[PDB]
């Protein structure tokens, strides 16, 4: 059985922890629940660690006293189709391969499934590690609890003897790098300096060998990503988000200085050897919008190229870990601000951005966000019980599964069927404009080889490439974004109409140029 | 927010608690979750209590770390028919009235329903307190969580100014006495001597005025009835059971000395 | 009422039947259940038939004493979508028309439906008989029992007066030939020599007029295809399968000589005029893997061309009735072994194979097959009854309809939802790779006219055509195969990655060659 340690002893050296722990709702929770510090206490000095204490990062460290939150978190939604490729006619982006050609997502981009699987899915997806990591067998794909207990309880490594990124299956890529992991786990929270900058106290950084890094990591979406383990207060831990909100002074709501002030973030830094090492962002309120924005944002987590001169931006560059913290209509300016693009299109040669699941930046300015609604109201509602102690559901999933606790809790004028119908109106309409944007994008793309081969000038091809950047951005935001318009229907509509406008302009440009070369 | 107390100070006087607490699965659980001992600790000696510390008996004391067990406990099974008299042709004993004539159960004997209601149902049944205690209104019969939070949040007393057992409704009895309560609550666990014998240190005993006793009690089936709050180990607290099993040497399984 | 005949009289001439009948589980079943031999017995001599006895081939001949097996067999699974074209964005092969152009399957290739309909569906499909045969009206499409009672109770013939294959509707083909029928019915079992070779005792052969042959046939999937009517023991009757397993010595499990020996097949030949005429394969065990392999295999059942010189291989050639009995990775070698291909692609001019539903060859080597699992365990499980006599369900259908009797009977650690989720993981992943293989195949195909028209050399076009053969094979196996990877997920994955590799190589080859012609 666990034996409590003398926290007063720890506090004599760890004054930041004392200030947080003694005052919050974990004041009675002994350090031994999460730390084995026996050898540490015997060897530390006032400002040198000595022997490293062992810190538990598994979610069952919290499940001990918070079974309901843990069990709702680990639930697998079997109705969320697993390993379902988005580049298929029945998924999000029927023409994805043509439009993304040149980018590693062509190797595989599946729909998201339940959070229990995030780290294992990151490890096994075809675009990430050259097929190096696989489930131990095909039965393991069902095992959410197993994945939560640890990725390496359910996966294998094709070659434990090597640490380089390479292809073990022919149609795979090696896109993963250490930045990715920040949005899959925080097991490395004590081994990773803020932003992944080089640091003598950091085992891991942006430039580490990702295969070696991968082997050190086990648990998905640690409970402490949103809740400080010492104060039990709401926080974020993601470096890129703290960088945008605090370092860059953009605020938690960049379009609303008042709301940003009322629902703000305080950056707290921890040091190693009296030098800044890592940071967390303590929240004024338990604001799920900002908590979920640790991952459900558009970001850089990869090498790329400069827009100005096409030169390589490698993992060593700060830009390889970046939250744009910009809506779709401010994105092009945000990418120019850091002089960055992701890939050159394999067919058109245009410099293009790669967009990632921008749910947070999309939700801004919606009628719901402006009315003070937050992700948890729809995706983590309070449980309603005929008799019992209320808690917050941690099964993050579509509101379709809990319409009474989500939509209908605020929309008393609707039946469940009416509220579902409202959702489907927006999603159907938005998906139609996504498909039409793809049609026009593809028509434009296919004209590039025809233009080049008819000897159309580089100047005209470059004008078309500029249009491609915009046609791409104003489309891809919405196949990347997971709500199919629901999070901000007016913005989806305006953006997708702009994509089509840009593609149409480029199609006309190229067709005319081709016809002139022929005549 | 709760602030932990120094349990080592408690242990300097409370050696039986130390032996249980330091070894079991609640070794990390601070006393302040269930005891307000600030004034006690300032005034006690190992031989003189001084100020009485306050001990929490409500089930939500355990529900903060054990929500799943608490929430499953307080669920109301609506299919367990409520207030259903057994002496009817469609229940357990169609000829109960004839057979039991002369006993207080003739006044009312309902089928049991969910544990959340045990204490309130004990208080309101027609055979128990002469109809003195009733639900505040007919809606409150559904409120299992309310009953668990405390009987007196959902019940009324027909005459707060008197403490004698008497009939407020014609066809009731006053069968209840202090022993009944031991199978409805253990809120009185520090105020009741073993078996309910007279004792200088007991507020309540077998010979107490049951109406006054009733007013001091709130929670049904406390979680600590089966789980020692200090060791977290399995236990019983009921005096009559310990008396049969241990004092009378009958054993937990009288028909099986090995078991 | 039926009157029993004296079997001793028959046995005096039919010693092979006596040896089988007297010893098996039909020893008490009188010949009159299936044979009207009155005139035969009056006219036969020791080795000349005399008058032909009438043999019942309808399934109700068995339903008499085996109602449960018959009634489960004839059940129509209404959830198996009927007449559903695979070349549609919501079915198996969204780009099928582009990829198969040149082949008769372009005229129509529907998903399979319940076995009751196999013969009528063969007769009415647009690719088979020029639209000659149709249901009597559109209501008849529901009538499984009616189709079982006889195809000609529910179909019509546009022209009873002619017997030639021709088009009655514009967008039909005349692909059917007599070999097809062997996988739809065995009503012809006494009128068809082994392999369909010419034989003076055979009414029908590979070279017969298929329209005339069609009119002689009535019943789907005769009960005796898997069960010898004389011994009641397990068997196969399909010539092509006996040829591969026995004549070619490949074994019932070609990758496993031990299992082949334990679960083998004995070829039994029946003669006419003391010359070999027909054959059956008696099974050592009631092994559904081999029983279902009578039809659920890749095969030739059609004319084609030689790979060596492009010359025609007609129905007269043995190769027009062939079971390759090879997995996807041994197939190209198996097709070269008989010097055969199916069609030339209409756009690329590549010689290509046509792949057919290779479930048996795919299942080989899977974790399930290696563990001794067989088709019936998932598709014909034993019925579980609270009280009753157990029998084998003959409703051959997806295990989704009977998860308790199929998957969960062996996988006790799973709920129904978890087992369905495991299936969907594999099918979703495999379908994504099918769709990507099609994308790359189509991109390659579309470059052929551009290359030809830019004057790219025949030598380069021929290299690309060689790549097309492989890109096609490693894709088409999986749109042909019905499990969408489930029967062998690792093999599906490796094959489909190989298809994409081959197409990519060809795309690069052609693009470079085109660009050089332009510059
Ligand atoms: C001074 C003699 C110390 C005592 C007493 C305790 N700790 Fe410590 N710890 C100390 C130092 C100088 C450092 C490096 C960081 C810093 O503040 O300078 C640490 C670090 C830790 C950590 C982080 C470990 C990691 O992997 O990065 C933990 C989790 C930790 N310490 C816990 C801890 C506990 C629980 C203690 C009481 C049992 C304790 N420390 C005492 C110095 C000192
Ligand atoms: C028992 C020994 C606990 C351990 C292990 C963990 N937590 Fe806890 N938590 C515990 C208590 C007694 C309380 C107070 C309950 C109350 O409302 O008074 C809490 C509270 C929380 C909260 C709520 C915080 C708030 O500001 O309202 C959170 C979000 C929380 N705990 C999170 C949490 C995490 C993430 C844990 C794993 C690192 C964890 N707890 C462990 C008791 C215990
Ligand atoms: C936070 C800013 C993230 C970064 C850094 C990475 N990922 Fe991610 N990922 C993130 C979210 C919010 C989601 C779910 C929403 C969605 O649209 O998918 C994901 C999902 C994945 C998945 C599963 C679905 C899929 O795309 O196949 C995989 C396999 C995945 N992510 C891999 C991955 C890689 C390889 C990364 C570094 C190049 C990476 N992720 C970074 C959030 C974030
Ligand atoms: C961010 C993505 C979160 C993660 C990771 C975890 N929790 Fe959480 N928690 C989150 C929100 C938005 C809320 C509601 C806040 C509000 O006030 O509305 C909570 C709440 C809790 C609580 C408080 C009691 C309750 O309302 O249920 C606890 C004790 C808690 N969460 C525990 C917990 C556990 C054990 C986690 C890992 C399984 C966990 N949280 C992760 C957001 C997030
Ligand atoms: C980084 C640690 C994340 C945090 C914080 C949040 N999400 Fe997430 N989410 C993330 C990933 C990598 C994935 C895909 C996981 C996979 O294995 O494919 C997701 C997925 C979702 C989903 C889809 C679930 C489904 O049934 O398909 C939803 C609805 C979702 N995420 C919502 C969500 C909410 C509301 C969050 C704040 C409370 C949140 N996520 C945080 C990564 C991360
Ligand atoms: C958090 C501050 C707690 C309070 C309040 C209560 N309990 Fe507890 N309990 C807590 C922990 C950390 C553990 C250890 C869990 C483990 O398995 O490691 C426990 C354990 C129990 C057990 C099981 C003990 C066993 O020997 O099997 C029981 C029966 C139990 N706890 C009961 C219980 C009761 C009745 C409480 C109210 C009086 C109570 N706990 C409060 C944490 C906390
Ligand atoms: C609106 C026109 C009502 C209808 C329909 C139903 N009830 Fe009602 N009820 C209503 C009011 C305004 C009140 C008083 C509320 C208060 O606390 O002041 C009630 C009361 C009850 C009670 C308690 C009666 C008592 O004597 O204590 C019960 C048991 C009750 N209501 C139940 C009930 C049922 C089951 C209904 C459908 C058959 C029903 N009510 C309808 C208003 C209205
Ligand atoms: C433990 C040995 C008990 C004693 C002392 C008392 N009761 Fe009881 N009671 C007990 C149980 C196990 C049950 C449920 C099973 C059953 O058969 O009822 C009850 C139930 C009640 C009820 C509700 C059902 C009913 O009979 O109407 C009431 C109203 C009740 N008990 C009252 C009551 C009285 C008045 C007691 C002292 C005279 C008494 N109980 C003692 C267990 C035990
Ligand atoms: C009644 C007059 C029957 C006719 C017509 C058919 N079958 Fe039969 N069958 C019959 C009996 C009495 C038995 C023995 C039952 C037993 O288990 O003892 C059988 C058995 C079979 C079997 C099981 C064979 C085995 O080896 O275990 C099969 C597969 C079978 N019968 C098939 C079958 C077929 C295909 C029929 C139509 C050609 C048919 N039977 C007719 C009785 C009768
Ligand atoms: C009475 C008002 C009818 C309604 C309602 C439906 N049907 Fe009908 N149908 C009706 C008749 C008199 C006939 C002709 C019957 C005959 O054999 O002469 C039909 C025919 C059909 C057919 C066959 C069409 C063809 O062969 O061209 C089909 C497929 C059919 N009916 C289906 C059908 C459906 C699905 C209905 C509800 C949508 C339906 N019918 C209604 C009379 C009536
Ligand atoms: C056994 C080696 C077969 C040969 C010879 C023929 N077919 Fe076939 N057919 C076979 C199976 C196992 C299936 C079901 C599985 C599947 O993938 O379809 C079929 C199905 C059909 C169908 C229905 C579905 C469809 O393709 O439209 C038709 C119409 C059909 N078969 C026609 C057909 C023709 C015309 C053949 C000779 C050229 C032929 N089949 C031969 C097995 C076998
Ligand atoms: C091959 C595709 C089959 C066809 C055609 C028919 N049956 Fe069948 N039968 C088949 C299998 C795989 C089995 C199970 C073998 C095992 O031992 O596991 C059976 C079994 C029977 C039996 C035996 C009793 C039973 O298990 O149900 C009988 C009597 C039987 N089958 C009858 C039967 C009938 C009447 C058929 C035409 C409707 C028929 N079978 C066709 C495989 C195949
Ligand atoms: C040739 C006589 C066959 C035998 C032997 C087996 N199958 Fe078959 N199967 C065949 C055809 C021609 C078809 C398509 C029929 C049509 O009209 O379209 C099928 C179909 C199936 C299916 C699909 C059923 C559905 O609901 O869609 C399944 C699941 C199937 N076949 C399985 C199967 C099994 C397990 C067999 C051995 C017991 C088997 N088939 C034999 C042709 C023939
Ligand atoms: C007994 C006759 C089985 C039937 C019916 C089903 N499965 Fe199976 N399966 C079985 C065994 C003995 C094994 C190997 C177990 C081991 O760990 O050694 C399996 C394996 C699987 C797998 C993993 C495949 C792989 O890793 O390559 C899966 C995904 C699986 N089984 C699923 C599954 C499904 C969905 C079933 C119904 C369609 C099913 N199995 C039936 C034994 C048997
Ligand atoms: O503790 S040391 O720094 O004197
Ligand atoms: O690649 S992750 O960002 O979806
Ligand atoms: O029967 S004849 O052959 O003599
Ligand atoms: O044409 S049949 O083989 O599907
Ligand atoms: Ca999903
Ligand atoms: Ca991006
Ligand atoms: Ca009851
Ligand atoms: Ca089907
Ligand atoms: Ca073929
Ligand atoms: Na979904
Ligand atoms: Na869809
Ligand atoms: Na095109
Ligand atoms: Na009951
Ligand atoms: Na009853
Ligand atoms: Na189907
Ligand atoms: Na479909």
Biggest beta-sheet profile of chain A: 3 strands, antiparallel
Q: Helix count of chain A, per DSSP?
A: 21
> Biggest interface, and residues per chain?
A-C, 27 and 35 residues
Under CATH, the topology of the largest domain in chain A is which? Flavocytochrome C3, Chain A, domain 2
CATH superfamily of the largest domain in chain A: Flavocytochrome C3, Chain A
User: How many domains would you count in the coordinates of chain A?
Assistant: 3
Sheet-strand content of chain A, in percent, reads 5-15%
User: Judging by the overall fold, what is the CATH architecture of the largest domain in chain A?
Assistant: Orthogonal Bundle
Structural Rg of chain A: 24 Å
Main location (chain B): periplasm
Binding site for heme 1 (chain B): 10, 13-14, 40
Binding site for heme 3 (chain B): 26, 62, 65-66
Protein name (chain B): Cytochrome c-552
